[PDB]
Design a protein around this ligand. Structure first.
Ligand SMILES: COc1ccc(-c2c(-c3ccc(O)cc3O)n[nH]c2C)cc1
Ligand SMILES: COc1ccc(-c2c(-c3ccc(O)cc3O)n[nH]c2C)cc1
Lengths: 337, 344
């Protein structure tokens, strides 16, 4: 155990809200501040999760695949710790940091499948760990991307966005895209794909467009995954008739909640097996997409009617200020689990 | 507390299935067997939940629990006697029935009392972690009552000459018409609804037999339990609807769909009462009629869930097991585990 990882674990991750993240990019010409935050936060999160890997079962940590993960994280942690001596005023430091972050985003690019093989080689504590390990990566990928897309010279992301956050996200538009994205995957395999019957309701101000601060890609991931599932299930279960049953989506904005319910008539699944769809042990989709919903204090649930069809609901937070990161911490409360 | 409650605490509850239930009274499964199994079981269940009660905070264990303990200990002791008696003593069976009729009427005031104490709990001011423990304890306490009452009714209705419906086995309808139970439970809510409101929602009911398509829906179940769950969900669906659409021309129907599947009987009641925000939902389940309802669903391995759309309406869905052999009792056990009561 390298002295830096034992050290930086001895801190707790600091969750940020999308309001705050938003701010690192507005009147704020200060990447000076992002640099001092992230050169501290990234090592802490990586160190926390490296520590929780040491408790994984003997046979598991010693898989080729986990050992490769260990070494990348340990490498990026090292690389980030080296920026600790420089000042946030050092223009040369600010820029190397962008490159090193790009370097770490790259190094970690194979992390999520590698991890899978790592388990597909070796119960309920796996699940607990995989959910945390993956949330950990979602959160670091997001902080690095955010910094990279706001400050780097040559990755400027979507101009509407501050980083990858759309402060005025057209929720239904994302629903159409993700559906129209899944709709054309399904046509690679079937003579037909379900249509989209969609309804919106604006709690706050009625008959006005639905917009909230969110990260459009995370939403896109959730919805696509759930639309693909709906379609495949609607086409398998009705392999008889001519036209399929449409897929019904309602988008609802309320005081605190942004809710999206996706309904299909794909035959459903028994209560007993639902719990397995959300298990890592196909994917990694439903499980991951749920981590995405939960990553900012939302959620994703499945309610099926075995013999008829399935409802999928996503919950997002409606206000930037309550969209707060949900981060695992390696402490004793976690130790006993 | 006598050398009794501790002895039978040593044992863990033995869950029955509705199939076994159905047979403990089928083809005249002599009251001897049921006598024998219940004179053991009921004390163990009472013994079990009684030990839980002696972990409750100083003061709570109150004008309430003070008395619940007594009834259970009396009841437990009352049931003890028939150990020294043999199953063949008909005078004893006939007394087991009445002794089962007394305990009941003794316990019919359990549910009231216990929520009294909830006077007050620990210190007369109670925090989240202590409070979560109350939620914990209470799901178990009521599940336990539901389970003991269930078994006692069964014995009485099938062996005492208080006889229920002859077509039923005790409180269980081996051919429960689920859809008819939904309509009556709906109707019982519509009336109560209309004793207080100017107008009430309609029932737009849909039906799908996945198991055997054209055929009506019948599974093995206890109609009253089904009625208790459904009444409460309808009672909530209508009131949310009527309240939310004070401004609307008419009211929208409450929509329910009944589906029977390979393994599951599923019932989904949905409304447009403007819903409740994701943050509040749990409060809805905090300690009573909704919490208790969920306990009924889970009693035989089913479940009750709400998923709402704050700003539009709400989906309530009931899950029941469609096969009798899988409809097994969900009982609390007191032990090392249960006794033993991260992210930012
Ligand atoms: C992941 O592989 C799978 C596993 C199960 C299914 C599936 C669904 C379903 C499952 C999830 C959902 O959101 C909507 C649905 O209609 N309904 N029926 C089946 C057979 C589809 C893909
Ligand atoms: C007084 O208790 C309550 C508390 C809250 C509600 C309620 C529900 C609801 C809640 C549960 C349900 O099953 C169906 C529903 O439409 N939706 N909207 C409201 C304001 C209704 C009764």
């Amino acid at each position: 155990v390298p002295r830096e990882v034992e050290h930086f674990s001895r801190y707790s991750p600091s969750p940020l809200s999308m309001k705050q993240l938003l701010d690192f990019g507005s009147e704020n010409a200060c990447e000076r501040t992002s640099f001092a935050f992230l050169r501290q936060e990234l090592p802490v999160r990586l160190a926390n999760i490296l520590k929780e890997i040491d408790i994984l079962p003997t046979q598991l940590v010693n898989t080729s695949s986990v050992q490769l993960v260990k070494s990348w994280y340990i490498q990026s942690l090292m690389d980030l710790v080296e920026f600790h001596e420089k000042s946030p005023d050092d223009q040369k430091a600010l820029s190397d940091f962008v490159d090193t972050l790009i370097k770490v985003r790259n190094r970690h690019h194979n992390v999520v499948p590698t991890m899978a093989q790592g388990i597909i080689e070796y119960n309920q504590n796996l699940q607990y760990f995989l959910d945390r390990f993956y949330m950990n990566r979602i959160s670091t990928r997001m902080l690095m991307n955010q910094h990279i897309l706001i400050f780097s010279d040559s990755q400027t992301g979507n101009p509407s966005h501050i980083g990858s956050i759309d402060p005025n996200c057209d929720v239904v538009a994302v629903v159409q895209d993700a559906f129209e994205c899944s709709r054309m995957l399904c046509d690679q395999y079937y003579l037909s794909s379900p249509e989209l019957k969609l309804t919106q309701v604006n709690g706050k101000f009625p008959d006005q467009p639905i917009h909230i601060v969110y990260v459009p890609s995370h939403l896109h991931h959730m919805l696509f995954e759930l639309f693909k599932n709906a379609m495949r299930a609607t086409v398998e279960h009705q392999e008889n008739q001519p036209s399929l049953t449409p897929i019904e989506v309602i988008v609802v904005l309320g005081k605190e909640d942004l809710t999206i319910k996706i309904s299909d008539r794909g035959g459903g699944v028994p209560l007993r097996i639902i719990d397995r769809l959300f298990s890592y042990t196909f994917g990694y989709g439903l499980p991951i997409s749920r981590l995405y919903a939960k990553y900012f204090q939302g959620d994703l649930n499945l309610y099926s009617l075995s013999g008829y069809g399935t409802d999928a609901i996503i919950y997002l937070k409606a206000l930037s200020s309550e969209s707060i990161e949900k981060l695992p911490v390696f402490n004793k409360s976690a130790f006993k689990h």
